[PDB]
């Protein structure tokens, strides 16, 4: 049983909870590879037993283990599975096991809200058109014109024989990024292959540096058809800054809703690779990772010359003072727009509360420190201070392979 | 089988062959990842080390395979068969001690891990002669504000003899004072030592800044006091270049920052008193160990005398006073004319050193949390980059406080 510090507080606590782990990360006693963002790579008589562990664990978190109803659903998965070699999740168990797949995420700082969350069953979905509709849907309750609310949406489970639901987009909304000459890109470098993607699939490309892309969305064999996202459901957010004057006309501007959408849901060993989520954005991923990033948008001189600093040496820390302007101003923007955002601050303290929550409902909590310490700021965050132990609890989201 | 190692600023891959040799076991299983734990933790395999050690000797002065080679290790193994260790050649020493350093998963300064002053104390037999060493070490290695990397190796553990030891975890260290209130006036890390210190006879201070005196022990010897001559410690005031007020904080902080209780281990021979230094990057002073709320503890303070409105964390006035004293930091060591490397030029230098070593040895031993500087870790190159944390050896260790 691991031996956790907090070095703040000099408390000491152990993960019990470590020791249920099962799925194997990618570290072993002679190298860590924690700091690795892929790790490593991506007879149903195994299904048998992650759905029976699954089964044990809904029946816990309602007291009911132990004779009654309990013993009775056991039997139903142990004949379903007989009978088709897979099986069908109670509505319920799918809205108990989409939550604690968000409370297992070890890099999720946002845990503190995982027992509120909306789940859409669309397990009966059966056309790419459906799918568009149901994605619209989400948007929209998701949005919420600015009020956002964390929700997920489980299209139908992979089956043996017959391909999967597949969204090609890795987030609901996405800006375009367009290659030219030099080979630089105009718009989001991250997106430079989706978008030329929706281009060979029909998309007719745009203006400039915030384009919207078109949704790519996959039924099952049928290839991917093109959808275009209607506007007025795509709430967006210009940027400004409330003493610097000029920053507005940068014409920076970033979007409301996170919504990951190429990440594969799995449940008591059923998997759902189309099953897109959203919460809402803490804002130093819009204004440090997304606009500074040196292969993002990089800004960060742009604004410094505005600013008037000290380009010409980093010991003038002017890298610094850019990147908490720009931080100043998303969270400025996204008030003054009435769109739920969070700072670094505010988040890394309530993931602190979440894991004394976690402690004594768990006794453990998986944190994966590289991703919980924000991209700035890092140690005036009390999770900084803390020590955390990373593993792989199921219901997950994992990582898998794009669709081509 | 060896781990592919991606940059995503670059898009840039390799493998991290050398890892494949990792000499030791860190505290990582395929359970579990303890990556962010800061401590993680005869004959016959003293001599399995020992000829490891010989022949990275004998392989970086391009003699592998050689007659002196060969030569050399059945000396040693000679030498333990008769008296259960053996003796490390001057210049074995200087080439381990360097590779302890350029093995040193934490150090983000290891681009100038060739560039290392090796002092050669194993001739060293008490505390008096330990203190003149310390005192020499200091002012070679301060040089007057142009600082120079160094390491002082007194003699190594030995069966029938107790450990030399260093009982201050740094040579130059701030007292830290227990207080009516319960508080700490001084440094709050340091209470264990200053208390130590008075109860070996140490009239106490009463400022934040009070330089601790040393506690030096001989084998088999009680720790006995000594105190540092003022002229060999040199300091920096801190002040702000276009913040007036901050001088009058009277915050300061010391030159050298001089290790002084980690293990060296060289070939199975361990060294518990070899005090090294280099020179402080300036988030350490500015972020660490001013703003930590277990240390100093300054940033609401100066927040405050900054007009910042601390009523709301979305001001992110937290950020805004923490930039500013690293600023002071760096402008104050700079107008002292003392030696100073900030975080963006320090990972910069690292991000090269790993280069180097993929070139030399197949790839670097790195922990990425504390590679990645305290403020602004994303504004740097390392955070981008993938790294492999493994223990080789020669190495520094830490090793349990000898109270
Ligand atoms: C409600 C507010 C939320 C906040 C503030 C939040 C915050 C974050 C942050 C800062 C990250 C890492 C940033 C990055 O990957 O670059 C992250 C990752 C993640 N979040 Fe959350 N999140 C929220 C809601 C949710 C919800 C509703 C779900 C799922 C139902 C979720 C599941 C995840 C997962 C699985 C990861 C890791 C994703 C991966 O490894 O690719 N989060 N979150
Ligand atoms: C020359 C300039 C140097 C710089 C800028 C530098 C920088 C650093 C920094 C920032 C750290 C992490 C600090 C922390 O623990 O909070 C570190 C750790 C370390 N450095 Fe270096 N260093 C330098 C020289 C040296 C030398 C000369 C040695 C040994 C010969 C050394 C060995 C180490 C070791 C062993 C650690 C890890 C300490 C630990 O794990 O607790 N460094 N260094
Ligand atoms: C619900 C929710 C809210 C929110 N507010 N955020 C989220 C973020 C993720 C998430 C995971 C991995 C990512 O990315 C992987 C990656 C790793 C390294 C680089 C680099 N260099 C780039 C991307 C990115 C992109 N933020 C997001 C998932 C859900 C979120
Ligand atoms: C040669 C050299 C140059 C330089 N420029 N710097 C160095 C810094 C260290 C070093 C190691 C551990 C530390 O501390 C370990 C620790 C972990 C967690 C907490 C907490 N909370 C506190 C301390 C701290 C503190 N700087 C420094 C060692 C050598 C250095
Ligand atoms: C190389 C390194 O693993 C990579 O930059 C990680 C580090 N920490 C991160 N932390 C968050 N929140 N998001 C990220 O994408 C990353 N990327
Ligand atoms: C809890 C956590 O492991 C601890 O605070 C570490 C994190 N990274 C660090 N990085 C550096 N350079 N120095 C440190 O002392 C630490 N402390
Ligand atoms: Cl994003
Ligand atoms: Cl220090
Ligand atoms: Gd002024
Ligand atoms: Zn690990």
Redesign the pocket.
């Known amino acids: 049983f691991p031996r956790v510090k907090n ?1 703040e507080v000099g408390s000491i606590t152990y993960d019990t909870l470590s020791a249920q782990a099962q799925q194997d990360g990618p570290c072993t006693p002679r190298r860590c590879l924690g700091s690795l963002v892929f790790p490593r790579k991506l007879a149903p008589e195994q299904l048998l037993s992650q759905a029976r562990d699954f089964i044990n664990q809904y029946y816990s978190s309602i007291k009911r283990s132990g004779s009654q109803a309990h013993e009775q659903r056991l039997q139903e998965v142990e004949a379903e599975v007989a009978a088709t070699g897979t099986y069908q999740l109670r509505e319920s168990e799918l809205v108990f096991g989409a939550k604690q797949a968000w409370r297992n995420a070890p890099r999720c700082v946002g845990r503190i809200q995982w027992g509120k969350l909306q789940v859409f069953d669309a397990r009966d979905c059966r056309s790419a058109q459906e799918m568009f509709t149901y994605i619209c849907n989400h948007i929209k309750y998701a949005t919420n014109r600015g009020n956002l609310r964390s929700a997920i949406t489980v299209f139908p489970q992979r089956c043996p024989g017959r391909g999967d639901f597949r969204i090609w987009n890795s987030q609901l909304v996405r800006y375009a990024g367009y290659r030219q000459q030099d080979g630089s890109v105009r718009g989001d470098p991250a997106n430079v292959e989706i978008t030329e993607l929706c281009i060979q699939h029909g998309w007719t490309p745009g203006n400039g540096r915030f384009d919207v892309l078109p949704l790519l969305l996959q039924a099952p064999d049928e290839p991917p058809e093109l959808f275009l996202l209607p506007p007025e459901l795509v709430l967006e957010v210009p940027l400004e800054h409330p003493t610097l004057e000029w920053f507005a006309a940068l014409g920076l501007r970033w979007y409301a809703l996170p919504a990951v959408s190429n990440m594969l849901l799995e449940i008591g060993g059923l998997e759902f690779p189309a099953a897109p989520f959203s919460g809402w954005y803490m804002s130093t991923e819009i204004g440090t990772r997304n606009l500074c990033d040196p292969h993002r948008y990089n800004i960060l001189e742009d604004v410094a010359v505005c600013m008037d600093l000290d380009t010409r040496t980093t010991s003038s820390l002017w890298k610094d003072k850019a990147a908490v302007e720009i931080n100043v101003a998303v969270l400025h923007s996204y008030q003054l727009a009435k769109v739920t955002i969070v700072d670094h601050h505010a988040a890394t303290a309530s993931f602190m509360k979440h894991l004394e929550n976690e402690q004594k409902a768990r006794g453990g909590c998986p944190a994966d420190w590289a991703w919980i310490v924000p991209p700035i700021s890092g140690s005036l965050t009390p999770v ?4 955390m132990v990373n593993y792989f609890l199921s219901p997950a989201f994992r990582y898998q392979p794009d669709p081509w």
């Open positions: 070095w900084f201070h803390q020590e």
